[PDB]
Amino acid sequence: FACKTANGTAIPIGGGSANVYVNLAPVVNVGQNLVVDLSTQIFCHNDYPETITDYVTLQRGSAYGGVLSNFSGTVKYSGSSYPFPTTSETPRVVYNSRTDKPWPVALYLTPVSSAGGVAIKAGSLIAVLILRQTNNYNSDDFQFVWNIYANNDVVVPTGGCDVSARDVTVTLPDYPGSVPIPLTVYCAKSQNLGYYLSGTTADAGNSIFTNTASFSPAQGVGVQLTRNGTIIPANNTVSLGAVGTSAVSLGLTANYARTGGQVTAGNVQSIIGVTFVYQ
Amino acid sequence: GVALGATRVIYPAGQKQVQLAVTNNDENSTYLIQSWVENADGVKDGRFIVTPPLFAMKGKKENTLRILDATNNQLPQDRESLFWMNVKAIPSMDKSKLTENTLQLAIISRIKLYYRPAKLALPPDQAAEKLRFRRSANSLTLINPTPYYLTVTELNAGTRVLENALVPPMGESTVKLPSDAGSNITYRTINDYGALTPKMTGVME
Ligand SMILES: OC[C@H]1O[C@H](O)[C@@H](O)[C@@H](O)[C@@H]1O
Known about the structure:
The complex is a heterodimer.
Chain A: E1 2-5, E2 10-11, E3 16-22, E4 34-37, E5 42-45, E6 54-63, H1 65-70, E7 71-77, E8 80-84, E9 93-95, E10 101-102, E11 105-111, E12 118-120, E13 125-135, E14 142-150, E15 154-155, E16 162-165, E17 179-181, E18 183-186, E19 191-198, E20 223-227, E21 230-231, E22 238-243, E23 248-249, E24 252-256, E25 269-278
Parallel strand pairs in A: 3-14
Antiparallel strand pairs in A: 1-2, 1-5, 4-11, 5-10, 6-9, 6-13, 7-8, 7-11, 12-15, 13-14, 16-18, 17-24, 18-23, 19-22, 19-25, 20-21, 20-24
Chain B: E1 2-4, E2 8-12, E3 17-24, E4 31-39, E5 48-51, E6 54-57, E7 61-69, E8 81-90, E9 102-116, E10 132-133, E11 139-144, E12 150-156, E13 165-167, E14 171-176, E15 186-189, E16 200-201, E17 203-204
Parallel strand pairs in B: 2-9, 10-17
Antiparallel strand pairs in B: 1-3, 3-7, 4-6, 4-8, 5-7, 8-9, 11-14, 12-13, 12-15, 15-16
Bound molecules: alpha-D-mannopyranose.
Alpha-D-mannopyranose (MAN) is lined by residues 1, 13, 46-48, 52, 54, 135, 137, 140 of chain A.
Subcellular location (chain A): Fimbrium
Keywords (chain A): Fimbrium, Signal
GO molecular function (chain A): D-mannose binding
């Protein structure tokens, strides 16, 4: 029983170890699968098929470098899947031919939301796979160790941030009242954010959002947003700085402002757009 | 909580279409996704079209936005052209707060979209380095001769930390030089993957 690498290298009868060099998808997104198919690069064969039956097993599977810190994954061995890094010696597959058959092993790796840019360095030890071979002939128990190196960087693009917002705020604090506006943002990967408001305005300072509502339009008012006392006029980019894993409150408050002159009873409703700009 | 799967998009000149991911976190609350692309000046020309132009995302879901090139190669072919991708999340009217004074917000994600003429020499990886300077006692002028938009971030007059800059292709930008200077100009940039390139040293031209 011996195995060889599609690249060239072999591990002879009795076991030993070899390097397996793999080119991986250059880009993988959070949520997706990075697939390292070794069945395309590692082959074995039985040396005496007619009288001996060989049993190949995935003894152990271990992760290194980026694979270890940026991914969660499974190992598909001969049709079935298991947790990778592995936790138990896999079931045994049989080899019965002098003809080089593949070793059906594939790594299915999915980047974590926290995965940087370069989740796997070019030239790094990505994994070590231990092939254990026995037989129905004697006490032969040999190990074929495969050291999997990545030939290139596998980048995981940075995603957009999440704008955690409760919902349709009831700016009910009757005409003079003002409420705080719960709105925070967090990013799986720290990055600079900025935002600006947008919508129909009712003033020359362009910062009092027009009253939009049917039920007897409480005329003369309008909604104005403030951030810790500072007024936010439409299309004025407010720089949030670096936003990371800890949510950042924009510190918004809805305020009533007067547009025209005579204020009048009725409802006051409004829709404002908040646009987060990514660097 | 609706989020885009990228903080930017590279549109390869020629591609029939590029796609972007959108995912809605809020386990319960539908949204109307309305997307569009404005040009550098902020005007909605039809250079690029997104589909579906309007659709719903109910609860935790994931869908794909596809950006279509409408610009019949009527853009400069020696450099990238700057555009802005916008994805708006439209909530729904509560028939519950109907006779109440209410305020509704519509979150929008706006990211850069570069039209990259697929036929340029200098490979993107090899662009940040080409960044030279010109530092006075108040007017440091980032200078980019390549054909890519340089998103200069973490800039420093050696010790002093400055304000980020976006340096246009074969163009330049001047960031207010504080004078708490040095010349040990330092900066990193943001690559096609919205990833920080490695810190490099300012090299005044
Ligand atoms: O291939 C069959 C047989 O070949 C050699 O004798 C050794 O590698 C054995 O361990 C193996 O069982």
